[PDB]
Structure 1
C-alpha cells in the first residue's frame, strides 16, 4: 500500500502465530518487539536510541507477516516502548520513502535515510524517521523563546527545548514547524515535518 504520516504508521503483524501492532520505523535499523516468547534459540544483545541502551534477545530467521507481506529475519525482543518494524524487515517487503507522494526523491532503506536539511541558516544531516512524532535536532544555539519538554526514545527520556514556527528545508523542500533541541545522537526529522513535504511510505 501507500501510507501517509498524519497518524503513526501502525500496522498489524503476525509473528509466532500471534497478532501484534507495530510502528513502521525508517529510523530503526532493527525490528524490536515487546516481551513475548518465540520459538528457537535467542542470544543477548544491547540496542540503543534516545537516552541510551536496553538489553534484548536476538532471534534470527523469524517469519513475520507485515500487513500481509512476508518477511523472514531478525527480531529483537525486549522492553521497547513501542513495537517497531525496522529497516531489516522494511527492505524485505520493498518499503521505500517517497517525497511528494512519489513525484520527489525515492529513498530506499538499505542504509539509514540520511539527508541534508537547512535550519537556522545551517546545513545539517538528519535521519528521516517515520517512527518519530517530532523533529529533534542536536544542540544548536537557536536564538529566541522556547518551552521545556521531555521526549522519549528507546533508552528513556531526554529533556529538550521546544521552539515553534522554525523553518526547516529538507532536501530542498520547505517546511515550518516545531523543532526540539537537545542531546540526540542523530538529528531526526519526524512526522510533524515529513507530512508537510508529502512524504509517504510505499510497498
Structure 2
C-alpha cells in the first residue's frame, strides 16, 4: 500500500497469535510493543526516546504480520506509550519513504533517514519520523513569539517552545509550519511538515 501522513500511520499487526495496533515509525531503530507475554526467552535492554530511557525485554526472531506482510525479527516489550514498528521490521516488509508520491527522492530505511533541512537561516541534519506528530528542533535561538508546550514519547516528556509559521526547507522542498524547540538528541521532522512535502510510506 501507499500510506499518506495526514493521520497517524496506524496498522493492525499479529504477534504471538494476538492482534494489536501499531504505528509505522521511521524514526524508530527498533520495534517496541506494550507489555504483553511472548513465547520466548528474552533479555533485558535499555532504549531511549525523546524523554529519556526505559527498560525493555528483548525477544529475538519473533514472527510478526504487519498489514498482511510477514516479518521475523527482534521485538522489544516494555512501557512504551504507543506500539511502534521500527526500521528493523520495516526493512523486512520493503517499506520506503517517498517524496511527492514517488516522483521525488526515495529513502530506504536500512539506516536512519537523516536529511538536510534549513531553518532560521541555518542548515541542520534531521530525522524523518513518521511516528512524530510534530517537528522538534534542537536548541536554537529562533526569533519570534512562542508558547510553552510539553511533548512526550519513550521515556516521558520534555518542555519545548512552540513557534508557528516558521519556513523550513527539507531536502530542497519548502514547508512552513509549527516548529517545537527544545533539548532533543536528534532534530525530528514530523507529520505536520512531512505532509507538506508529499511524503508517503510505500510497501
When normalised by structure 1's length, the TM-score is 1.00
The Cα of 1:130 is off from its aligned counterpart by 0.0
Pairing 1:117–2:124 present? no
The Cα of 1:114 is off from its aligned counterpart by 0.1
**1:62 counterpart residue number:** 62
Deviations 1:77-126 (A, max 9, x none): 00000000000000000000000010000000000000000000000000
1:101 match: secondary structure: helix
CA distance in 2, matches of 1:126, 1:25: 15
Deviations 1:50-101 (A, max 9, x none): 1210000000000000000000000000000000000000000000000001
The Cα of 1:10 is off from its aligned counterpart by 0.1
Instruction: List alignment gaps of at least 5 residues for structure 1.
Output: none
CA distance in 1, matches of 2:144, 2:67: 44
2:134 match: secondary structure: coil
**1:199 counterpart residue number:** 199
Deviations 1:123-152 (A, max 9, x none): 000000000000000000001100000000
Runs ≥4 residues deviating over 6 A: none
Alignment of 1:1-203 (within 5 A): 1-203=1-203
CA distance in 1, matches of 2:79, 2:143: 38
CA distance in 2, matches of 1:57, 1:40: 11
CA distance in 1, matches of 2:99, 2:44: 38
The Cα of 1:153 is off from its aligned counterpart by 1.4
Instruction: List alignment gaps of at least 5 residues for structure 2.
Output: none
CA distance in 2, matches of 1:50, 1:40: 29
CA distance in 2, matches of 1:130, 1:30: 14
When normalised by structure 2's length, the TM-score is 1.00
CA distance in 2, matches of 1:137, 1:114: 13
The Cα of 1:200 is off from its aligned counterpart by 0.0
CA distance in 2, matches of 1:51, 1:18: 29
